[PDB]
Design a protein around this ligand. Structure first.
Ligand SMILES: *C(=O)[C@@H](NC(=O)Cc1ccccc1)[C@@H]1N[C@@H](C(=O)O)C(C)(C)S1
Length: 641
């Protein structure tokens, strides 16, 4: 009994060495090489595990049901059940057994081939055959391809079929001008350390039709991942990359030759899209005869993922941003279907997945507008669009009378002298008797600031807490929950008023804004957005009152229709529009000149068929989201009713 506890310890640390992959440490816990003892030397055991466990990518050996007995003055037997993870999934219910040795004072293991796999004897071999799974597709709400696997045209040259000096330089210049490639990059491609004179050195993937091929230029079809919308949906869809050895160490069920999603939905739905590897892991005898099949199953190709995205709305939304920094979210607000999730500027995901230059990748990483940012999932201060919610809250708690007129003189206002030099500011002093309708049409900050301070912080937060602040949206998109402020209290009349008209410490991303603003298309019911097509519609009742929606939406119509409405340029469409604009000012202590973000909210107040939230980040002068929304509004109004 005093020594049986030492034997259980030995089996435990032997398994732990195999589990951690230290096959050398496990080999040094074996007996001397002899009959009825260890079957191989320590260095031979190290190679046995490294070859076999490495061939099947064995990872995580954990055991159970350990039993250690005594059969002799120095021969203690043991047995346990074990399970492990391999390239073909989990291998469970493994019955291991053996013996130990109690010579001197320490305890060692009489190693045998049955401690690699249970059924192995002597010089048995292990064989692994595998079949790659085809990656599933990502498709829009109408089955159009967003991410698919197809045949690509691979352009490349063979250095020997170019020339010997003047004939080679003439062809390199002819190939550079015929396929739009840097002539200095073609000479750097055939000069890499892996290139032989007769090899096919790939250059670029031509996406159109094959032009005339000069001397030495060839075209070779190759299968690869393809994104039809290109940069227009790069942030949302993402890209796949070559699987590394480090990836396999974390998940052995990946394909060493396959692709793995690196960002976006390709990474979010990698498990569903990549499928499962098929094949057979078997033990053979010394003659090659199949002795036992440990694992075997057929290849399961990846499942397709169908999104709510409209591929034509996505491309229209992205192109409307003109390469400027910004984002656009389009929904069907009654159900929550996300029609478009555009972010700009963007990167080329096809170039990204077909091998990209280190120079081209750094141009993306050092672009000040940062194309890699998923701006539709980035929190921003919403701007004056948030007045719709402050007003709705004020109507529900009886603070705001829609017809009551406030006297506001000039362009500046402060509660009292304790605000110092700070003042709320409005753009026009032409209306001194301001009601809710006028405040929404003109976007009067002073009206909103006074109504917010009038209702107070308690009532304001009571209405705010009924929305989705702090909630994690059920979306396959990485994002942080929206916030009202940094802490649970404003502890500032100035901060309270600023929050009223959408400034302050508010942080809401465009998707969360589309969710909060859905109340005005559902009589005060919030409808959570939805990206996966088959998902069920989830909502939130009684966020704001139905009375508030009936009061505010007719005013939002006048934001478009009134001759002085901030969105009056949208009247040219001639379609039923309810809108609200906004311009947020950002001045952190790192930039001298301040930045401005433009915002636009718009939906159909007749049929509630669509709803959009567009924004421009660090906008240029004489630029806005409203300037750019006509084309997407025409499409959404025509196709979503
Ligand atoms: C809400 O966003 C409001 N914006 C400001 O008070 C800041 C600002 C920024 C630039 C110029 C002037 C004032 C109001 N709403 C916006 C808008 O709807 O675009 C206005 C510029 C009308 S002020």
């Amino acid at each position: 009994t005093q020594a049986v506890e030492a034997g259980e310890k030995t089996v435990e640390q032997f398994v732990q060495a195999l589990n951690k992959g230290d096959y050398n440490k496990a080999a040094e816990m074996t007996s001397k090489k002899a009959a009825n003892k260890s079957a191989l030397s320590e260095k031979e055991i190290l190679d046995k595990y490294q070859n076999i466990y490495g061939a099947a990518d064995v990872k995580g050996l954990q055991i159970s049901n350990l039993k250690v007995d005594k059969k002799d003055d120095s021969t203690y037997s043991f047995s346990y059940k074990a399970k492990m993870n391999t390239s073909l999934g989990e291998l469970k219910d493994l019955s291991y057994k053996g013996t130990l040795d109690r010579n001197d004072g320490q305890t060692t293991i009489n190693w045998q081939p049955n401690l690699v796999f249970p059924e192995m004897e002597g010089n048995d071999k292990v064989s692994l055959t595998t079949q790659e799974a085809a990656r599933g597709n990502i498709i829009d709400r109408n089955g159009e391809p967003l991410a698919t696997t197809g045949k690509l045209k691979q352009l490349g040259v063979v250095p020997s079929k170019l020339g010997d000096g003047g004939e080679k330089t003439a062809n390199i210049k002819a190939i550079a001008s015929s396929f739009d490639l840097t002539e200095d990059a073609i000479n750097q491609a055939i000069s890499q350390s892996w290139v032989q004179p007769d090899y096919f050195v790939p250059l670029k993937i031509i996406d159109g039709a094959t032009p005339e091929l000069p001397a030495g230029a060839t075209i070779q079809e190759v299968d690869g991942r393809y994104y039809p919308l290109g940069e227009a949906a790069a942030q949302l869809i993402g890209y796949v990359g070559d699987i590394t050895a480090e990836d396999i160490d974390k998940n052995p069920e990946l394909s060493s030759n396959g692709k793995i999603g690196r960002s976006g939905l390709e990474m979010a739905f990698d498990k569903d899209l990549r499928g499962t590897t098929g094949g057979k892991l078997s033990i053979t005898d010394a003659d090659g005869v199949e002795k036992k099949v440990l694992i075997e199953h057929e290849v399961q190709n990846g499942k397709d993922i169908k999104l709510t995205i409209d591929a034509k709305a996505q491309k229209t939304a992205f192109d409307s941003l003109g390469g400027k920094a910004g984002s656009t979210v389009a929904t069907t607000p009654k159900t929550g279907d996300l029609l478009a999730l555009a972010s700009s500027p963007s990167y080329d995901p096809n170039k990204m997945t077909n091998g990209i230059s280190q120079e081209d990748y750094k141009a993306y990483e050092e672009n000040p507008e940062q194309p890699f940012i998923s701006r539709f999932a980035t929190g921003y201060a919403p701007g004056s669009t948030f007045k719709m919610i402050t007003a709705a809250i004020g109507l529900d708690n009886g603070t705001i009378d829609p017809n009551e007129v406030l006297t506001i003189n000039g362009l500046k206002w402060q509660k009292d002298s304790s605000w110092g030099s700070y003042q709320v500011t409005r753009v026009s002093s032409d209306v001194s008797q301001v009601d809710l309708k006028t405040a929404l049409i003109y976007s009067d900050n002073i009206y909103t600031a006074q109504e917010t301070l009038k209702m107070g912080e308690k009532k304001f937060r009571t209405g705010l807490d009924k929305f989705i602040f702090g909630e994690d949206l059920d979306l396959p998109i990485s994002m942080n929950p929206a916030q009202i402020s940094n802490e649970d209290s404003f502890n500032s009349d100035i901060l309270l008023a600023d929050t009223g008209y959408g400034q302050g410490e508010l942080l809401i991303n465009p998707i969360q804004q589309a969710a909060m603003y859905s109340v005005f298309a559902n009589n005060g019911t919030l409808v959570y957005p939805k990206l996966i097509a088959d998902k069920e519609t989830k909502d939130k009742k009684n966020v704001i009152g139905e009375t508030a929606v009936q009061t505010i939406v007719p005013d939002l119509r006048e934001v478009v229709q009134d001759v002085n409405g901030t969105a009056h340029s949208l009247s040219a469409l001639g379609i039923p529009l309810a809108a609200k604009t906004g311009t947020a000012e950002i001045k952190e202590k790192q930039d001298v000149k301040g930045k401005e973000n433009s915002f636009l909210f718009a939906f159909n107040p007749d049929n509630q068929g669509y709803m959009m939230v567009s924004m421009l980040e660090n906008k240029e002068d004489d630029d806005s989201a409203t300037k750019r929304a006509s084309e997407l509004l025409q499409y959404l109004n025509q196709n979503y009713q």
